[PDB]
Amino acid sequence: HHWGYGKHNGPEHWHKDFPIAKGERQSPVDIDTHTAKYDPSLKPLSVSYDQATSLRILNNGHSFNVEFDDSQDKAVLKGGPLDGTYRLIQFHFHWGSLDGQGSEHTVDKKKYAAELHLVHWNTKYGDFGKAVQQPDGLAVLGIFLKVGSAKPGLQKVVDVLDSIKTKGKSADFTNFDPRGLLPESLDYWTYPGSLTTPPLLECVTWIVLKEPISVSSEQVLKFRKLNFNGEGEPEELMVDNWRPAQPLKNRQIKASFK
Ligand SMILES: [Zn+2]
């Protein structure tokens, strides 16, 4: 029926409704740090999130998204391997049922507890919908989460999850600053890929940060209290909403550092 992460509608079933699932540039992938090519041509990333305007937090049934006002160049990303300006539209997470799994991308086969995705669309295309239909339409900044000390900047998000426990629920979420989710270093790996959830369009330039951010066990625990289901239905905890690594095929992963 509808896609999900369960035994009967999980990742291995997606190809039936979205044949692109078996395409040539699917994500996520395993980052082999020894074969990734350091490219001196890559420019530093430029993240300008000082004017970011968050609007709402929503449980869409597969994750929770924090949405931003993308009607103007308020929070943008440029530089790196990108040509042009990409606007931040939303960020969301993928996490596991246990601390040893949860991330989508892996580094030398190592899985992290969760993975943060900051989705941006190329302004040259006018709107998000047109952007996803282009090979260079989106830029997604991926950040790994490891369990350790608390991330102060993440607490506001954690505190509101109670109000959006089930599918379809949303709440006002203004004045949230995404800069508090960033690691200290901006070194990264990049390769051409796709969305990791249906429609799995191959329109993404992935920018995966080398440095993980630390979150406490109590923080990740609250992610695990969310529900895939809507209110009034049998409770199915939202955990392990991650897609396994896909084959790299004819792609090269480039690193911005040596
Ligand atoms: Zn994602």
Curated annotation (Swiss-Prot):
Changing T196 to S/V: Reduced activity. GO terms for biological process: angiotensin-activated signaling pathway; carbon dioxide transport; morphogenesis of an epithelium; neuron cellular homeostasis; positive regulation of cellular pH reduction; positive regulation of dipeptide transmembrane transport; positive regulation of synaptic transmission, GABAergic; regulation of chloride transport. It comes from Homo sapiens (Human). Its EC number is 4.2.1.1, 4.2.1.69. It comes from the Eukaryota. Target of drugs used in treatments against glaucoma disorder and breast cancer. The record marks Y5, N60, N65 as: Fine-tunes the proton-transfer properties of H-64. Catalyzes the reversible hydration of carbon dioxide. Can also hydrate cyanamide to urea. Stimulates the chloride-bicarbonate exchange activity of SLC26A6. Essential for bone resorption and osteoclast differentiation. Involved in the regulation of fluid secretion into the anterior chamber of the eye. Contributes to intracellular pH regulation in the duodenal upper villous epithelium during proton-coupled peptide absorption. The active site is at H62 (proton donor/acceptor). Changing N65H: Enhanced proton transfer. The modification Phosphoserine is found at S163, S170. It catalyses: hydrogencarbonate + H(+) = CO2 + H2O; urea = cyanamide + H2O. Changing H117 to D/N/Q: Reduced activity. One of its GO terms (cellular component) is cytosol. Changing P199A: Normal CO(2) hydrase activity, but impaired stability. Changing N60A: Reduced activity. This is Carbonic anhydrase 2.
